[PDB]
């Protein structure tokens, strides 16, 4: 399994604008378009992003392009962030995927706010960190996805996704 398959499992694929778990306008593989209430602001962001008049709909190819961009941007963001980079550098490959997943979902800023959990991961205290990560709005709101990620940090294996 790899980061792309992992994220494809967690986010799904939709070719028409949709509302995400928080009510925001999204398309493709978890590509947030806008936090604005306007479907119209959404369609505008969409066309800008694709470079064509999409009228709310995109192809598989467009969805995957956006996905490539987003994953790339997530990685670079981690690498550039002073709080995240040292955590990432300290982790094994599987756990690295787990932090990427969190950043793709909640942005750099959000994950960088998980101060204590970051510290524990750095320290390789898997169990303790799993329990701290669960004490978050993140876990309460998207618990099955949160558990899958948490399990990945906990064990260092793809078990939570081998099912799926």
Q: CATH code at 61?
A: 1.10.530.40
Is there a contact between 107 and 78 (Cβ–Cβ < 8 Å)? no
State the method.
X-ray
Angle between helices 3-11 and 93-112 (to 10 degrees): 50
The answer to whether 32 is a known ligand-binding residue is yes
31-34 vs 14-19, strand pairing mode:
unpaired
The answer to whether 40 is a known ligand-binding residue is no
| Residue among 114, 103, 120 at smallest CA distance from 6 | 103
Given resolution (angstroms): 1.7
Q: What are phi and psi of 37, to 5 degrees?
A: -70, -15
The answer to whether 132 is a known ligand-binding residue is yes
> CA-CA distance, 52 to 58, in Å (whole number)?
10
Q: Give whole-number Cα distances, 107 to 57, 58, 122, 125, 162, in Å.
A: 25, 24, 19, 24, 26
Residue 143 CA, distance from chain mean position: 14
Q: Give whole-number Cα distances, 101 to 146, 149, 152, 160, in Å.
A: 10, 8, 10, 13
Q: Give whole-number Cα distances, 73 to 5, 69, 79, in Å.
A: 17, 6, 10
> CA-CA distance, 52 to 61, in Å (whole number)?
13
Catalogue the active-site residues: 11, 20
For residue 43, what are the domain limits? 1-164
Q: Mark 52-80 as b/e (b = at least 16 C-beta within 10 Å).
A: eebeeebeeebbbbbbeebbeebbebbee
In degrees, to the nearest 5, what angle opens at C-alpha 97 toward C-alphas 118 and 133? 35
The answer to whether 117 is a known ligand-binding residue is yes
Total domains in the fold of the chain: 1
């Amino acid at each position: 399994m790899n980061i792309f398959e992992m994220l494809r499992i967690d986010e799904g694929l939709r070719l028409k604008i949709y509302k995400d778990t928080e009510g925001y306008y999204t398309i493709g593989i978890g590509h947030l378009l806008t936090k604005s209430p306007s479907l119209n602001a959404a369609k505008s962001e969409l066309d800008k992003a694709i470079g064509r008049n999409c009228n709310g709909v995109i192809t598989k190819d467009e969805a995957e392009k956006l996905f490539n961009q987003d994953v790339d941007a997530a990685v670079r963001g981690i690498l550039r962030n002073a709080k995240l980079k040292p955590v990432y550098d300290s982790l094994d490959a599987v756990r690295r995927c787990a932090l990427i997943n969190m950043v793709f979902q909640m942005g750099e800023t959000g994950v960088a706010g998980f101060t204590n959990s970051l510290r524990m991961l750095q320290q390789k205290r898997w169990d303790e960190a799993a329990v701290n990560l669960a004490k978050s709005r993140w876990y309460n709101q998207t618990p099955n996805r949160a558990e899958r990620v948490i399990t990945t940090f906990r064990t260092g294996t793809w078990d939570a996704y081998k099912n799926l």
